[PDB]
């Protein structure tokens, strides 16, 4: 019995297994990683020995994800995660590589929140039990699952087209649309609000916080269909489903008072989603 990654690299106590993730919202649970495309095992003596592999209780997330509960799909069936009991067995009865049919999910706890996971960091500590139908061999070992690429795991029922958006305005004056859409695994009554450092009493102009050679007299103002969106004011999108819906935002310049002088302009504006 032996296992390898999607890279073909053999999985060796404990082993560090690096996998690629494509996290995503599903209905009622969010995918963290589908390990069935990442981990493959086989049987070295299938004509005389059948191998069995289970997921032992105590298997759980690690790193930034250790705070979240969810589920594990093991060989087509769902179990609480962290696991509280041993799963049924997967059988390996062939020399040909077969997937380790495991997918790790997260219970949605936000509207459209996300947790950044960087490459090289631990996402899960999995405990396996290996037996056979031939002798009394019964051993446990640990697989530490590491991310092999930078991702963001969605923690909500909805997800965005991008977590970090950089837009460039034309030289003053001028406007640029902000590319940003949202969708939900199932239909949700969804809204959003802006936050950031504002310059005016009406909280309608985000301050020019450019560090190097900043301009004077101007800030950034966002509109939606020609209407000013002030900070901390919920924009309703109505019911949002699986079809991507634009937030409908456009960036503009706006005068903050006094003489307008040459220099750089920058504003960092947060978007936060809420259920309505």
């Amino acid at each position: 019995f032996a296992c390898k990654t999607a890279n073909g690299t053999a999985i060796p106590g404990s082993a560090n297994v690096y996998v690629n993730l494509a996290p995503a919202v599903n209905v009622g649970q969010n995918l963290v990683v589908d390990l069935s495309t990442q981990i493959f095992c086989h049987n070295d003596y299938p004509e005389t020995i059948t191998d069995y592999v289970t997921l032992q209780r105590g298997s759980a997330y690690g790193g930034v994800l250790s705070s979240f509960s969810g589920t594990v799909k093991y060989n087509g069936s769902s179990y609480p995660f962290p696991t509280t009991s041993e799963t049924p067995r997967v059988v390996y009865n062939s020399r040909t590589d077969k997937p380790w049919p495991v997918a790790l999910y997260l219970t949605p706890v936000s509207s459209a929140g996300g947790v950044a996971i960087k490459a090289g960091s631990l996402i899960a500590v999995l405990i396996l039990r290996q037996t056979n139908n031939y002798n009394s061999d019964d051993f446990q070992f640990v697989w530490n699952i590491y991310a092999n690429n930078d991702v963001v795991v969605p923690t909500g029922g909805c997800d965005v087209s991008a977590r970090d958006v950089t837009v460039t305005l034309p030289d003053y004056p001028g406007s640029v649309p902000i590319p940003l859409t949202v969708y939900c695994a199932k239909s949700q009554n969804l809204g959003y609000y802006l936050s950031g450092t504002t310059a005016d009493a009406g909280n309608s102009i985000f301050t020019n916080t450019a560090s190097f050679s900043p301009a004077q007299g101007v800030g950034v103002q966002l509109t939606r269909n020609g209407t000013i969106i002030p900070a901390n004011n919920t924009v309703s999108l109505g019911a949002v489903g699986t079809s991507a819906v634009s937030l409908g935002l456009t960036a503009n310049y706006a005068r903050t008072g006094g003489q307008v002088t040459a220099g750089n302009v920058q504003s960092i504006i947060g978007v936060t989603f809420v259920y309505q």
Binding site: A162, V165, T166, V167, V220, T261, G263, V271
Partner: peptide, 12 residues
């Protein structure tokens, strides 16, 4: 915030 928008501009 769930998304961070950085808006860059220039006055010439």
């Amino acid at each position: 915030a769930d998304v961070t928008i950085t808006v860059n501009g220039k006055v010439v």
